[PDB]
Amino acid sequence: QGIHLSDLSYKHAILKESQYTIKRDVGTTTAVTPSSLQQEITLLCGEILYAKHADYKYAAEIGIQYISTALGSERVQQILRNSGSEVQVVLTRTYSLDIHGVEKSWVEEIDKEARKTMATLLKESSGNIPQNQRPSAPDTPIILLCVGALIFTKLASTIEVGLETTVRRANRVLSDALKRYPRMDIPKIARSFYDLFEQKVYHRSLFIEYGKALGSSSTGSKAESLFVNIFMQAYGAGQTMLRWGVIARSSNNIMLGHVSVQAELKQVTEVYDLVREMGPESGLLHLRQSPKAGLLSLANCPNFASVVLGNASGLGIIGMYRGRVPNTELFSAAESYAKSLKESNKINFSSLGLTDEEKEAAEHFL
Amino acid sequence: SLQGIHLSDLSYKHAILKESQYTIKRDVGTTTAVTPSSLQQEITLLCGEILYAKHADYKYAAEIGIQYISTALGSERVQQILRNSGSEVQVVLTRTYSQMLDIHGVEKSWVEEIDKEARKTMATLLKESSGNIPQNQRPSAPDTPIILLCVGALIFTKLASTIEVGLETTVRRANRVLSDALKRYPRMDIPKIARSFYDLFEQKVYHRSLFIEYGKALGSSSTGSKAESLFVNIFMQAYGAGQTMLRWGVIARSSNNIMLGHVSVQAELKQVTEVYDLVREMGPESGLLHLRQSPKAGLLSLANCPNFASVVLGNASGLGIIGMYRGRVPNTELFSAAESYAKSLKESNKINFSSLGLTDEEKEAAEH
Amino acid sequence: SLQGIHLSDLSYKHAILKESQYTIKRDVGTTTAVTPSSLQQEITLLCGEI
RNA sequence: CCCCCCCCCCCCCCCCCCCCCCCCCCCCCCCCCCCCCCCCCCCCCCCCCCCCCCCCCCCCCCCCCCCCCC
């Protein structure tokens, strides 16, 4: 019985022992906006949504600039330094907004194009444009960031896959925002955000800190309360396998009782126990693109993975999941049981805890 | 043996929204009116003037109500509340001119209109009354701001639905609730006043938690007014805001709906449990989360358990509670079944001599 | 199995009416009569007169 | 009242040890395969509802304890 190694725990324990700290992004510089310029960046965000622009390259950087004003004039540097990146910040100024890394030409284009659209429309509206339709509306940066939130959820897949999902969901979710700013190019804005999250990796954890911070506040906007709710659906990032694993247990799939699957029990247990060891940060590990992540891989248990996927297929959840199936045999079996389970209707009078005079009348149900 | 397959995801989801050491500074340039405690009598009169006469416009009616709350809570204590709500908005102390009130954001023209129109109505009526208008019918009565805020309290309850739905409910209930107030001020335009409050709660989101703090504060005091004790009681019926599903969930358990025993529903047990355990984790603030328009809210969604939701709604339909609830029904099959059982339960009369714990000489007579 | 489906709403409802760190200042201008302890015999006589 | 008898203690014998014996002493590197992880879907919310309302002063008896003997 003494033949036992708790390897996975030790594997994690070694990634804590590092007393030494990595200083990556040595020369790098990124734009930060002081809290004082929140109204100016709000207007710029609105301008992006308000008119149909030629280029949506820096759209995401503008969104990050609103986060910057919301979190702190200089509190942002602290977050970035603490994310592991030794990148330096650059406080954006005003001229007659000068955002670091953002072409002055682009800023002027966005402003010019928006003013042109405002003039055209105000002539038609007979001088009547309500507050809610103007680029000045305070919720415009939140709307911009909500497109970013949707691409944040699908950061686990292709740059492509994410755009589909973003567009589809944005139509239902940002329904009313689209009514007021029908000129918002969701695909180009969403592309700017994918490009940003991929290049400036530290902005992933800055976005997380905005989410965390926003989630805490007493009073949120209708737009703000949406943002966090998109951010939440992003929690089980890259861990879809572990969550479908609990679903297989809940379904009581008889294939989880297979001798070859039973053999992998200790490895499976080790992974779920590492999640508890890591606590709340465990979920967003894959989302942060953390090197630590991947310890939560179910590679060590291929037969279990096969059953979990089979069960998901049988229940009709699997959808477009590309996850490789090691044991095709076990998969098919788990799928068959789950399909039979799916259709079958049964009653646990054990669970309900009724009187045997209420349980008497329940039998009478034809 | 296969028990260690468990993730407490919902708890972690909440735990992440506590880890935020960093604080958001929204509403950077914003300014709102505050009235010092000293001007409580002047704002009381203005509140009464709104109710007393039939006015042309009831735009700032809600802001006037907030101004009474301001006097009641604190000359400058209000800034603290607003700053602590997450909004970095600045306050502006309302002054006096000639005697009138200069409220920040409120058009001087509007203040004068409300006053002028009320004086005109007082003059018309005093001629009819033969110079006799009792204290209780004058805009000067001290309970007039509370009456104004009670219309706001009714729209506060229906902040969970349409701007429209709320007005129906507000009007209906106001007739029964503010029965006697309406007798003294029959000129109070409940729909316009209630509209001003919806507009205010939607625009100045920080005033939602200011209203909550007035409610919390009022709820604490030793002696309240008859009007004040009504306000809190409207505010209480507002506690289960947006969580109607969880409360109907306990009703389904209390009804012992056999559909809660369905295999597909049994499968969702752990998710359902996780949501009710998050309520306990969040404690008393859990209920008013949706009311505050808090981004944190929505973690209390029963989206993760569609089959359970179907049964809960079915049970509500069968018992005849469901009313005008637009809540989507994922499993139509389960819903119909739960509904049938609940309808049969509704009519059936049975006695648990097990629960009562009587002597079998009292249980003897009960059979008779 | 079906345990855990419970909300202690009424307790929370009360708990919220304790959290009020802020205090209400109603009856801002109001004035009421108080009699000093020294005049207890005089007020006693007046009570008797009624 | 209590108390009230009787009453020193001890007293023999007797050195201990004495054999035998160092321990240890063989063999023996370890290592050696495979293997990135991910991939679906999903805004939430939506009903109803002021509570309170009856009746009702309590109290009301009796009773020092102690008291022998030694």
UniProtKB/TrEMBL annotation, chain A:
The lineage of its organism: Viruses, Riboviria, Orthornavirae, Negarnaviricota, Haploviricotina. It is found in: Host cytoplasm; Virion. One of its GO terms (cellular component) is viral nucleocapsid. The keyword Ribonucleoprotein applies. Its main location: host cell. This is Nucleoprotein. InterPro entries: Pneumo_ncap (IPR004930). Keywords: Capsid protein, Helical capsid protein, Host cytoplasm, Ribonucleoprotein, RNA-binding, Viral nucleoprotein, Virion. The keyword Transport does not apply. Coiled coil: none annotated. Encapsidates the viral RNA genome by forming a left-handed helical nucleocapsid that protects the RNA from nucleases. RNA replication depends on the availability of soluble nucleoprotein. The encapsidated genomic RNA is termed the NC and serves as template for transcription and replication. It holds the Pfam family Pneumo_ncap. Belongs to the paramyxoviruses nucleocapsid family. One of its GO terms (molecular function) is RNA binding.
